[PDB]
Design an enzyme around this catalytic site. Structure first.
Site, short mmCIF file in Angstrom:
data_model
loop_
_atom_site.label_atom_id
_atom_site.label_comp_id
_atom_site.label_asym_id
_atom_site.label_seq_id
_atom_site.Cartn_x
_atom_site.Cartn_y
_atom_site.Cartn_z
N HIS A 148 -14.60 11.92 9.12
CA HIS A 148 -13.47 10.07 9.63
C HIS A 148 -12.95 11.00 11.25
O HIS A 148 -12.57 10.34 11.72
CB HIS A 148 -13.54 9.38 9.32
CG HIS A 148 -13.39 8.56 8.07
ND1 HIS A 148 -15.11 8.64 8.83
CD2 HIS A 148 -13.50 8.19 6.65
CE1 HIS A 148 -15.34 7.06 7.38
NE2 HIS A 148 -14.59 6.95 6.67
N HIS B 207 -17.98 4.18 2.90
CA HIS B 207 -17.12 4.37 4.07
C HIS B 207 -18.57 4.71 5.03
O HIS B 207 -19.65 5.53 4.81
CB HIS B 207 -16.58 5.26 4.70
CG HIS B 207 -15.42 4.92 3.59
ND1 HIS B 207 -14.63 5.38 2.30
CD2 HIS B 207 -14.09 4.20 3.37
CE1 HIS B 207 -14.06 4.78 1.66
NE2 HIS B 207 -13.59 3.97 2.08
N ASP C 102 -21.72 7.34 1.09
CA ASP C 102 -20.59 7.07 0.91
C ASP C 102 -20.39 5.47 1.35
O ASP C 102 -20.91 5.69 2.45
CB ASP C 102 -19.02 7.81 1.72
CG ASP C 102 -17.53 7.60 1.26
OD1 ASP C 102 -17.39 6.46 1.63
OD2 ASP C 102 -17.17 8.48 0.62
K LIG Z 1 -21.81 5.96 4.82
ZN LIG Z 2 -15.07 7.38 1.50
#
Ligand SMILES: [K+]
Ligand SMILES: [Zn+2]
Ligand SMILES: O=P(O)(O)O[C@H]1[C@H](OP(=O)(O)O)[C@@H](OP(=O)(O)O)[C@H](OP(=O)(O)O)[C@@H](OP(=O)(O)O)[C@H]1OP(=O)(O)O
Ligand SMILES: O=P(O)(O)O[C@H]1[C@H](OP(=O)(O)O)[C@@H](OP(=O)(O)O)[C@H](OP(=O)(O)O)[C@@H](OP(=O)(O)O)[C@H]1OP(=O)(O)O
Ligand SMILES: [K+]
Ligand SMILES: [K+]
Ligand SMILES: [K+]
Ligand SMILES: [Zn+2]
Lengths: 155, 369, 69, 69, 155, 368
Positions: free
Chosen positions: B134, B171, B169
């Site tokens: 990220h 995320h 993930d």
């Molecule tokens: K992902």
């Molecule tokens: Zn994650």
């Protein structure tokens, strides 16, 4: 979302680079090697298991050390069992090995400093800065280690 | 058979972020004991990662952002109030002692595993310490600080024909997508929650630019996904991809936050489902690079990674646990494998066929004969 | 237990010591071989010769325990 | 009882083999000596260092019998 | 009573004869020697007794031989025990030792010749000349030896 | 301490004389096993005796008497009837196979033990095979053929200052007396049955001749002598003799026929009594030479000689171990034994007779 300025930094990729004098003589330090010429024949695999729990028994601790102290040492010989006991019987394996440095890397106490814990944490309960301040010898890294180990002592 | 490499350092488990923060890197320590207690140490190489220097950090980030990390301290937190908000440092990225030294190891770990694959004498490597994606050039984000995954990839790009990236993930991997958005040799797949979720992106139209069309794919989904529901969408695309993309190197980010019992996630996955994925990828016999990442239920995380580590060796390991130090933390069952929650699938069969019916012939636009 | 930790040390050193022991008896096995033959020759064929040799070898170690009684 | 001849063959040979056995354990006694003290360091002094050494040395002989069983 | 002619034969005695080149290199042949430097300390005396009855057990006979075959052989080594078993295990100790000749001196059979005994003695009962005459291979010396050994076989 | 030598051969036990004859030299074999079974082998030398040649035989006997022994055989017994009666060969000395070879060993045995004493490096020697004294120059007599005791002594006389001979045997040692009857350096003592007994001699007047007076002594006795009765007559003379005769070498003929349970004897002796004698002789610490001789109860003979053999070592020996001839040792299976019920038939005045007479007779000899 899509920031053009923060995309990349001139990766300059080639995707062949045949023999570009590969790196990592230092970024990765081998500390364990298989051996399956004599060991893994379903005859001597158990021989190492009996050794393994032997360390987790009435033998000296360094800082509280069940088995992990011994496994890094077997790689020193690469094919032997008894040679480790020569240096394990030695006064300390921590001190005379300073270049490898792994002796300190495994795991990372006084009643007085332990007295200040119940006097330290049991009052403020969420400080985490006076904790190291009033216990000066220990760091917050060490002070946190006892928290996970203390959880068994209730039951 | 296939040789495997694994990386670990011990000082990571002592770091702490702050009050009530969910990420706690002590999780990596419990995994390391499990590999040894199960006897898998006989079948892999262990390596110690050294500290990562500012050199390879400057290769993506600015050299002045770094000098700020050296001058900060928690006691002098107040003087830099203007700069702290400027770089997103705050509630989602608190400040603490040893913040930089924590990232030196996670950066050093994957960058080290990059090379033994560049050595071109083995296929598989693992580092559950990394998996931070990220981050951006001039700001931390989503609990991450450094996008070490890209920094590890740059060594691979020099040597390896084509690198396929994956992000299971929950995320979305927006950071990695930003750096390969107009280049064809890098494909970026990402399965993720979409709709009121961090980072709030990852729609269907996030496709590429210039020549980059049909080279940065996404396949968003909603909550309640089952292990069997995962089957009908992962396998069919990949088989279509291998002759199409012609990969030479895989990078499988095993984001384990997608499992049940999560503080954050709301998926319906178990260990068998996420581990069912890797057996199909190993079937292709190509250079792999497994990485971790997110995960905040420390109990089930080590149960997943320890299984996936054995599967790369195509070895069986039985169900149950030996004597160890962290034994009692493994739930009241004390069994490796687990059960899911009671949630059902909220995705319709038509919702499955949507991108499937649309995108498979979209990919056929690409040149091949 | 204290005595158990010693027994875990025992399993480590058993094969090394057991190798040297096998070397010892081979020097004295020649006396055992003809002894088993002649006994069976005089008493009769019915007695299993090899079993008698195994019986004496286990008995020889029993008295060695007196060194560390 | 043909085995009576064998027990008397043993008495001729037992004092000789006991010389070589004592030579063997003296090699491994260096492992036991400092180790037993360290056990008595982590635990109280009540346990006798010499007794445990005598205990395991007898225990080692019992397992060697499997070669000649 | 007192025969003067049969008294003596010129003994010629001196009663000193200091060093007259003493005789008996041959009239007496030493076949056994003490040893008390290591043996007789009330520690190894019993070690030879266990050997002694070991011979009187399930081991080969030469002519019927319980222990006497072994004692003359220990003197061969003069300080050892195990060296005798090397030659005792040998095919015969009787044959390869011909110069010492003691192998035949210790003690001094067929069913056919044994058949003629009950046919020989049980008829005439006091001959002692037809006994060797009709059993030609054996002498009267050997024929008498069985008489003393046969006395146990009744009870 | 004192070193000891012992002699034995194995072929003696096979010889046999003839029907109903009491002497049977198998007795020597049983004694040999007892010395080894009791563990006494640790404390003595064993020697094998070789065959005795005609050379040392000619040193006392005639060379033509010997050639007759080679030409005789039991199958040709008849041709030599005139010569057989001429040399007393007959009922008391029957003929049999290996007769000469039997004496070759008994002659070789004592003659061999003679030398290691002449070597003058030890004191004590033993040979229970010998002890044959009744023989003469031209005739056998009293079950004996060769007077090997004298033949052994001749080697000693060359080296040793004075040799004292003793004859405890119930038979009288007339043969040895004949060869030292006029010489002073050899004293010949002999205790024996007298009155209707072979050889029918041994009176008080058998004293010597020329200078030989008070140098060939006798002390006859009658039946029923007790072990304690023996005490009052053996010790007092010997203590008087040692300063008087000044011996340098003893020859103790342990005639064991004087023990109870004898076919021939009628004495009242046990093992302790006859063995009590030697402890007094060993007290003087002088060169000894023990020999056997007569004896026809084979059971008690080996019990006596085995004890005397241990006493020369001044060692104790306690009962019987496992052996081959175990069952022959009576129903008791105990080493030591008991006497018969006979009492002493000799009066106290009968004791003082020669004692009161002879002790001052010996004082006639020169000493000051
Ligand atoms: K992902
Ligand atoms: Zn994650
Ligand atoms: O009270 P429990 O039901 O046992 O759950 C707690 C709780 O988690 P929840 O708040 O999500 O219920 C703790 O959270 P805090 O109380 O700290 O907010 C958490 O601590 P972390 O969130 O810091 O992990 C702790 O976990 P642990 O025991 O690993 O410290 C965990 O207990 P369980 O792990 O037993 O569920
Ligand atoms: O019948 P036993 O009680 O066993 O005794 C006899 C018996 O001796 P006694 O007559 O004194 O009892 C024999 O004597 P004779 O029958 O010949 O007159 C004797 O023979 P010798 O006198 O010729 O020795 C023989 O002895 P051996 O067995 O040695 O021939 C001996 O038997 P034991 O020796 O078993 O007592
Ligand atoms: K792309
Ligand atoms: K006499
Ligand atoms: K005289
Ligand atoms: Zn007599």
């Amino acid at each position: 979302r899509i920031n053009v300025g923060s995309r990349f930094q001139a990766e300059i990729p080639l995707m062949r680079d045949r023999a570009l004098a590969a790196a990592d003589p230092h970024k990765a330090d081998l500390v364990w090697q298989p051996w399956e010429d004599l060991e893994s024949s379903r005859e001597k695999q158990r021989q190492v298991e009996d050794l393994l729990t032997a360390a987790c028994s009435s033998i000296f601790p360094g800082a509280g050390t069940n088995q992990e102290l011994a496994l890094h040492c077997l790689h020193e010989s690469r094919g032997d069992i008894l040679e480790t006991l020569n240096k394990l019987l030695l006064k300390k394996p921590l001190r005379p090995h300073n270049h490898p440095l792994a002796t300190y890397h495994y795991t990372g106490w006084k009643m007085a400093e332990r007295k200040l814990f119940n006097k330290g944490i049991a009052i403020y309960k969420k400080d985490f800065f006076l904790v190291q301040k009033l216990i000066q010898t220990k760091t917050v890294a060490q002070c946190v280690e006892f928290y996970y180990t203390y959880k068994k002592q209730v039951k | 058979r296939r040789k495997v490499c694994y990386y670990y350092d011990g000082d990571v488990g002592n770091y702490y972020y702050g009050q009530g923060h969910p990420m706690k890197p002590h999780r990596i320590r419990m995994t390391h004991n499990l590999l040894l207690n199960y006897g898998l140490y006989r079948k892999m190489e262990i390596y110690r990662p050294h500290k990562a220097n500012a050199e390879e950090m400057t290769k993506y980030h600015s050299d002045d952002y770094i000098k700020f990390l050296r001058s900060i301290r928690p006691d002098n937190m107040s003087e830099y109030s203007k700069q702290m908000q400027r770089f997103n440092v705050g509630e989602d990225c608190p400040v603490f002692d040893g913040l930089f030294e924590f990232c030196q190891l996670s950066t050093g770990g994957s960058v080290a595993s990059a090379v033994k694959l560049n050595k071109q004498q083995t296929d598989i490597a693992v580092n559950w310490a990394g998996g931070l994606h990220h981050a951006k050039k001039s700001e931390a984000s989503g609990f991450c600080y450094v996008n070490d995954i890209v920094l590890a990839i740059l060594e691979l790009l020099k040597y390896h024909q084509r690198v396929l990236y994956i992000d299971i993930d929950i995320h979305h991997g927006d950071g990695v997508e930003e750096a390969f958005y107009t280049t064809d040799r890098v494909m970026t797949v990402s399965f993720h929650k979409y709709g009121e979720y961090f980072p709030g992106t990852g729609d269907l139209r996030d496709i590429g630019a210039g020549k980059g069309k049909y080279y940065a794919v996404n396949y968003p989904l909603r909550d309640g996904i089952d292990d069997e529901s995962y089957e009908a969408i992962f396998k069919p695309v990949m088989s279509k991809v291998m002759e199409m993309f012609q990969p030479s190197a895989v990078v499988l980010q095993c984001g384990s936050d997608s499992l049940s019992g999560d503080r954050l996630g709301c998926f319906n996955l178990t260990i068998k489902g996420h581990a069912k994925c890797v057996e199909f990828v190993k079937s292709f016999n190509l250079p792999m690079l497994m990485l971790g990442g997110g995960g905040y239920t420390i109990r089930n995380v080590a149960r997943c990674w320890t299984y996936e580590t054995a599967v790369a060796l195509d070895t069986e390991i039985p169900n149950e646990l030996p004597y160890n130090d962290y034994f009692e933390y493994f739930g009241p069952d004390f069994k490796l494998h687990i059960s899911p929650s009671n949630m059902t699938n909220q995705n319709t069969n038509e919702y499955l066929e949507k991108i499937k019916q649309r995108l498979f012939e979209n990919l056929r636009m690409l040149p091949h004969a | 237990d204290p005595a158990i930790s010693m027994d875990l040390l025992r399993a480590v050193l058993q094969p090394s010591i057991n190798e040297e022991i096998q070397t010892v008896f081979n020097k004295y096995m020649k006396f055992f071989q003809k002894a088993a033959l002649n006994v069976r020759d005089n008493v009769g064929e019915e007695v299993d010769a090899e079993q008698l040799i195994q019986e004496a070898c286990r008995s020889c170690l029993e008295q060695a325990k007196l060194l560390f009684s």
